[PDB]
Amino acid sequence: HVPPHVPFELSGAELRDAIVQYATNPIYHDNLDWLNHDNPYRRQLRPQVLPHLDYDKVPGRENILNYASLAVQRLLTSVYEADLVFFPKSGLKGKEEDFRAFYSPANRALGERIRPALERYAFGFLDDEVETTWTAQSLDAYLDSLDEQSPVEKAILGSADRERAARMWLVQFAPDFLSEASPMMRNVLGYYGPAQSEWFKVVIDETKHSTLFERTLESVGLESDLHRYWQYYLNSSLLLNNYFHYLGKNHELFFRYVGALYYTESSLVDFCRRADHLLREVFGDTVDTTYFTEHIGRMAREKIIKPLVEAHGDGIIPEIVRGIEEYRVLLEIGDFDFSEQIAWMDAQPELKKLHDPVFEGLKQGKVDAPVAHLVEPRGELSNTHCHDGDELCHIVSGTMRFESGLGSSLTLQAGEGVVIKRNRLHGANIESDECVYEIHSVGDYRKCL
Amino acid sequence: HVPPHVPFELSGAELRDAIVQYATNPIYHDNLDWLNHDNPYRRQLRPQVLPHLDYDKVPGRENILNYASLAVQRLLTSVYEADLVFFPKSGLKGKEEDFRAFYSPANRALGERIRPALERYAFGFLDDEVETSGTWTAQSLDAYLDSLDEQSPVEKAILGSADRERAARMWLVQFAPDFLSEASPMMRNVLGYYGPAQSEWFKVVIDEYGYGVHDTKHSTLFERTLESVGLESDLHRYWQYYLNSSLLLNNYFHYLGKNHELFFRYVGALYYTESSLVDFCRRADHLLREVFGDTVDTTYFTEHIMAREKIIKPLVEAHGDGIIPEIVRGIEEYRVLLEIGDFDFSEQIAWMDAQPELKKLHDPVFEGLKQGKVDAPVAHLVEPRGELSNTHCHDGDELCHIVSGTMRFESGLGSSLTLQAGEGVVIKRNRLHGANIESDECVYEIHSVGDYRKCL
Numbered sequence A: 001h002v003p004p005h006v007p008f009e010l011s012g013a014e015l016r017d018a019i020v021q022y023a024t025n026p027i028y029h030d031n032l033d034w035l036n037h038d039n040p041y042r043r044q045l046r047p048q049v050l051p052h053l054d055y056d057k058v059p060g061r062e063n064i065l066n067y068a069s070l071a072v073q074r075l076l077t078s079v080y081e082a083d084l085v086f087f088p089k090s091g092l093k094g095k096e097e098d099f100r101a102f103y104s105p106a107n108r109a110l111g112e113r114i115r116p117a118l119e120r121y122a123f124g125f126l127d128d129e130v131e132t133t134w135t136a137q138s139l140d141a142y143l144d145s146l147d148e149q150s151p152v153e154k155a156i157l158g159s160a161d162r163e164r165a166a167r168m169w170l171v172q173f174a175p176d177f178l179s180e181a182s183p184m185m186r187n188v189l190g191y192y193g194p195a196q197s198e199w200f201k202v203v204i205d206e207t208k209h210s211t212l213f214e215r216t217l218e219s220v221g222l223e224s225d226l227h228r229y230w231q232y233y234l235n236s237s238l239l240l241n242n243y244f245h246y247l248g249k250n251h252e253l254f255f256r257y258v259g260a261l262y263y264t265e266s267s268l269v270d271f272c273r274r275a276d277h278l279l280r281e282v283f284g285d286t287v288d289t290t291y292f293t294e295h296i297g298r299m300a301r302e303k304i305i306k307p308l309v310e311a312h313g314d315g316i317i318p319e320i321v322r323g324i325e326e327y328r329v330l331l332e333i334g335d336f337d338f339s340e341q342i343a344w345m346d347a348q349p350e351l352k353k354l355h356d357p358v359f360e361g362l363k364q365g366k367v368d369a370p371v372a373h374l375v376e377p378r379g380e381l382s383n384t385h386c387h388d389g390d391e392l393c394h395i396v397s398g399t400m401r402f403e404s405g406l407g408s409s410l411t412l413q414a415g416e417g418v419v420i421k422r423n424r425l426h427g428a429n430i431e432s433d434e435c436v437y438e439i440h441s442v443g444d445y446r447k448c449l
Numbered sequence B: 001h002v003p004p005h006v007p008f009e010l011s012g013a014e015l016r017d018a019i020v021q022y023a024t025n026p027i028y029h030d031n032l033d034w035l036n037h038d039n040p041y042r043r044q045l046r047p048q049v050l051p052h053l054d055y056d057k058v059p060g061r062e063n064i065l066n067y068a069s070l071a072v073q074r075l076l077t078s079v080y081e082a083d084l085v086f087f088p089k090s091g092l093k094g095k096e097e098d099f100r101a102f103y104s105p106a107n108r109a110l111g112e113r114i115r116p117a118l119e120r121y122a123f124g125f126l127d128d129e130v131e132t133s134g135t136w137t138a139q140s141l142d143a144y145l146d147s148l149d150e151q152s153p154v155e156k157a158i159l160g161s162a163d164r165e166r167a168a169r170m171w172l173v174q175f176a177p178d179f180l181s182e183a184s185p186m187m188r189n190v191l192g193y194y195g196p197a198q199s200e201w202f203k204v205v206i207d208e209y210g211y212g213v214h215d216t217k218h219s220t221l222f223e224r225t226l227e228s229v230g231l232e233s234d235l236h237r238y239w240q241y242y243l244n245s246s247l248l249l250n251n252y253f254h255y256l257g258k259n260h261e262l263f264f265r266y267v268g269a270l271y272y273t274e275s276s277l278v279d280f281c282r283r284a285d286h287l288l289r290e291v292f293g294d295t296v297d298t299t300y301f302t303e304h305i306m307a308r309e310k311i312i313k314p315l316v317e318a319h320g321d322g323i324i325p326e327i328v329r330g331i332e333e334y335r336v337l338l339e340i341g342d343f344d345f346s347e348q349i350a351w352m353d354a355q356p357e358l359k360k361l362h363d364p365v366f367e368g369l370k371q372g373k374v375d376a377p378v379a380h381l382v383e384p385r386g387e388l389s390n391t392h393c394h395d396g397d398e399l400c401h402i403v404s405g406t407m408r409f410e411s412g413l414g415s416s417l418t419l420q421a422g423e424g425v426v427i428k429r430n431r432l433h434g435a436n437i438e439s440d441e442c443v444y445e446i447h448s449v450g451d452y453r454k455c456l
């Protein structure tokens, strides 16, 4: 007789151990530099922190830019990308061991085992952000209803360094645009109706777009090897990219992808126009925007949505709508996260100065702040991360390079420091022989003023 | 600091339990019928047997058609196909629960966890079947590839059959998973970001996917081939009639496509398939016309009527001579699998055709057991109407003897015997077969004779 089915279950300490097991593959160890040097097999997952996170407590939207969420997004990107083919720009010779470490039976199996729990952690909040009886007519009404300055335009054009802000923006798209259509290709494997051929026609349109975005990056002094700028990828940028791998890998979510595809096709011309205009205003004639201008909706409605609704019934419509609404939530989070990061980068001189009154407030006992006393040698590079409350970094002796973003750095000497804002991506390196410094966990730095 | 890395490890009883855990998803239970009825989420893995197999003892080529290998091939096909999109021909309505059972976080994770061990079981034998030289260069690769370019074993088996049309239909269904999802394993190698070779690989896939035109799409052409000889094109109607070796051949390309450390093996296999394609399609068209006449639609094959220069050469130049043994290994591994296919298929057709004679061979074999020529273990079975034993094989020969009632003994597609009281059949080792009980009750015996010829 058939043995009983034990349901798949992985939680608590066993899940923590499984996540740590995946992430302690040596290719995921902290980088000694800020950049990956043409090695697409190395991704920084900061495995030393992973034993101390609670993967069972799924965060709501309000806590979705906390560190545990960033850590999970980084994990998921690596798990998903084991299905993608990468070779170094300079060729595979010399990088065979890393190649084999990333593409191994073990690395795939370890990542795939934790993937369900990681996806609940990453995407669970969307259950409460979105709510979806539908018919073809009411779907047509909802779609029709989907049709000024954008938050990204405002953040870049209003920046203290527009070129830096635009470069920080462009690198966010490196995983997506350089592997363009990869998540979409996941939906074209198999055997289904004429919708499969129509989905494949879209994939065919992409002279290859990846190569055009190489030129965009290179025209403003950025490189196009994955993932050079790993440590500068925002939480929300990974979240947006990972969403499409999530939909593409998990075919129970196929109809959500149908919806998201409609929305992306329907938004594509406006996005590309705005991107072209924004980049020209910032960089002038130096920037290559062919990638965006070459891309310049109804076809997805008629050729994909309609036949699927006819073949599979009205029951798929709430899934189609959910895909659109979930994606829109993620775009909002992206707008916020990116805007916050650019403001944080631009305000570094002021936040260096804010150290003094904040430090003085701690002395006067306005906040009772836990403090960590650290002593670190030269080249101890703390890979980028964030904290869930505000912190005060105070240098006692030596010299620290405090990294707040791409092209955004402060040198901090004895007696100096910086206010570190919650959820903002940052790291540090020690530039002197030894650096003695303090981290005060102030929660809200404004309470120290 | 970084905790120590515990290496991924799954073996022994823990591996057995993990395999059973995957395969006890209800969508993998025995079918009550011979055919799946337009439900692409149901695949018969015979989970009741899985606790009793030894997954740690990797078989060599000589034992690669044993039951444990068939069972593992069936598992792997299901694991790989969780990445492929299927909907029923008749639409999804009514099949939503099965859809969600196949495409679930749990079903994927359970299958992916056992996939490394399954792949060692399935493909480990190839380590001893292919040699790995350490002196490859571009010139010696060109010499080898040049040295690759009569009646085939498949042609002989079909044309020499007692029922040619039946043999050709059995042949055609072997390609259903491959041709109906055509280019799916190849698409796995086009995801990501690599050189100009990626675009060239994609240019091959575009031909196989009919440039996004459905009627011109190859899958649709093979639908017509199947339907023109009275077969259906819903996956996987004929699951129970898929040979071990046919699953092995299909799974090999999912193996190479999913595991990008094997990317250069796929480069090699792709070269071999492209260089053999015209000859295969000509022979297939000619063979099918000879068997079926004008009734058969062969457009799929005639439509199919450069990898060296556009894919192999740039990769060798970019990544160096170290990739060449992998390219060669892919070609040689694939050729070994084609040989196994030729053998397995030929053996199955001969087994199907010889059923009347094997029914008669029951008598002298049964008499030899009475005279004690072989000391054979025997299993006494009593089963009710409709107890359908899903297709499988055994590692030694068996004698099935019916004491009372009526059994439909299934040896292949369109190949059946009715066995009554006092009758029976010699069941040849490694040959795919099943049974159903056609009377209210059937009392029968299975004698494990090892080699039936020793009873004569």
Ligand SMILES: [Fe+3]
Residues within 6 Å of the ligand: A180, A205, A206, A209, A295
């Ligand atoms: Fe594009």
Ligand SMILES: [Fe+3]
Residues within 6 Å of the ligand: A385, A386, A387, A420, A426, A427
């Ligand atoms: Fe920090």
Ligand SMILES: [Fe+3]
Residues within 6 Å of the ligand: B392, B393, B394, B427, B433, B434
């Ligand atoms: Fe049997």
